[PDB]
Every structure is written in C-alpha cells, then in structure tokens.
Amino acid sequence: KNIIIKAHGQTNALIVTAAPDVMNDLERVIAQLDIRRPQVLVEAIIAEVQ
C-alpha cells in the first residue's frame, strides 16, 4: 500500500514496516545518508585607527 516509516527518538533508531522485498532501496539510501561530517574553524579580524 505505502511505506510507513516510524522513528523512535529515545534510542535514536528508526523502523521500516513497509515493503518486505525492496527494502534494499532503503538500505542503500540510508547507507548513503549516514556519514561523519567535517567542521570548519572561522575567525575574523578587524582593526582601525582614528
């Protein structure tokens, strides 16, 4: 019928009670959607004279 995705939030895990045959199209996409992310350090400087 449809794909019903439910997310827990209290263990930070999600379910998939949807098609029992093409779930592979979900494992691939979540695997491409869970990835460590790099972070950047920003510093700015200003100066003047009067």
Binding site: P20, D21, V22, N24
Partner: protein, 51 residues
C-alpha cells in the same frame, strides 16, 4: 450390454462382460493416473513476491 450411471458419491458401475472388465479397468486406471493435482513451491532469494 452394460449401462453407466452417476451418483454424487461418484460410484462408477457397470455390468458388461468379463473381458470388457479388463479393457475398462485399464482405461480408468490409465486416464485417472494422468497426473492429477499436486503441489510444490519455490523460495526466492531477493525479488518481490506479490509483484
């Protein structure tokens, strides 16, 4: 000679002769033994079922 009749209990009766018996027994035994209903399945590795 013989006759043939049907009852909802699938009786199959005749009188005939005694040589006729051979030919007709052989008839039904061959034609009924022609591969009546049997069931078998197949699993499936990964593809969709209901589809």
């Amino acid at each position: 000679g013989s006759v043939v009749h049907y009852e909802p209990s699938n009786v199959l009766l005749m009188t005939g002769r005694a040589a006729v018996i051979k030919r007709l027994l052989t008839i039904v035994e061959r034609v009924d033994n022609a591969g009546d209903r049997s069931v078998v399945t197949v699993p499936l590795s990964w593809a969709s079922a209901a589809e």
